């Protein structure tokens, strides 16, 4: 009552016992703190089997094994922004059937020497569909995503893909190789659109972060002997309730082969990886003229 409730942990669900001799709560000590979302929980584990029994979003239906091998990102279903989180005073448009639907991007070919590709979201859907038109026309954008990476191969083919959702996937460069150039990635590398961008150094993900530790992020496996598809339902994560869809990518979808594709001669050498993504609970605010970027 004698101090401002202005620390960085106000509004949280944990009571912090602290010591404060000042007027502001942020001046106080760190104090004490008086399935798992980070383990890529499934739809069965999230208790969301009712929303995944048959995945039909908009006028689009994907046929895939549900519930058990279908991942909800960070244990959070996508949802519309609440009144408390939202700051923009104009009411956003929620098309929900013209923009919330599965879009099929491209059919990148998986080779034995393939390195991997990344897709930046919603940069992939910036210039196609009613979702693309709404993203170009509105300043503010907020949506979840249902990424359904598909890679069909025969029972005599082998290989696994790490289909992972990397939030705020900032692309770094080789810095001239010697590390003394301060180079920056181009626009076509940072926001490669629907056709994506191939990883130059998949070990560091072209960002200096190991590919091995990518599984803390919402991830899936397309181990070809077990599953031919990877469904990751991805919520909207940002420090902001809304953001621009043209100059900020909320996450990047990494699809790299951890285990190389291999098959004997005679089998079909064209093994394509098809990226399908459905925006979920899309919210567009701040309407003006359409801008490509």
């Amino acid at each position: 009552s004698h101090e401002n409730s202005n620390s960085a942990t106000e509004g949280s669900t944990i009571n912090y016992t602290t010591i404060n001799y000042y007027k502001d709560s942020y001046a106080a000590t760190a104090g004490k703190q008086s399935a798992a979302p980070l383990k890529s929980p499934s739809a069965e584990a999230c208790g969301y089997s009712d929303r995944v029994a048959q995945l039909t979003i908009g006028n689009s239906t994907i046929t895939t094994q549900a519930a058990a091998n279908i991942i909800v990102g960070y244990g959070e279903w996508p949802s519309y922004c609440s009144d408390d989180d939202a700051t923009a005073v104009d009411k956003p448009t929620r098309p929900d059937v013209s923009v919330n639907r599965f879009y099929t991007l491209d059919t990148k070919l998986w080779e034995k020497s393939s390195k991997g590709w990344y897709w930046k979201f919603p940069d992939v859907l910036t210039e196609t569909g009613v979702f693309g038109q709404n993203a170009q026309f509105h300043y503010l954008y907020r949506s979840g995503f249902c990424i359904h990476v598909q890679c069909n191969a025969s029972k005599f083919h082998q290989g696994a893909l790490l289909v992972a959702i990397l939030p705020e996937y900032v692309i770094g460069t080789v810095a001239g190789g010697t590390g003394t150039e301060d180079s920056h990635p181009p626009y076509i590398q940072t926001q490669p659109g629907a056709d994506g961008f191939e990883l130059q150094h998949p070990y560091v993900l072209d960002a200096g972060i190991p590919i091995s530790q990518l599984t803390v992020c919402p991830h899936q496996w397309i181990n070809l002997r077990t599953n031919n598809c990877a469904t990751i339902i991805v919520p909207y994560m940002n420090t902001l309730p809304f953001d621009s869809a043209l100059n900020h990518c909320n996450f990047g979808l990494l699809v790299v082969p951890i285990s190389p594709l291999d098959f004997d001669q005679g089998a079909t050498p064209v093994i394509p990886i098809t990226i399908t993504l459905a925006p979920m609970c899309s919210e567009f605010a701040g309407l003006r003229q359409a801008v490509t970027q």
Binding site: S82, D83, K91
Partner: peptide, 9 residues
Amino acid sequence: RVADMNTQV
């Protein structure tokens, strides 16, 4: 949590 969704005389 949003609350915006015969003629007479």
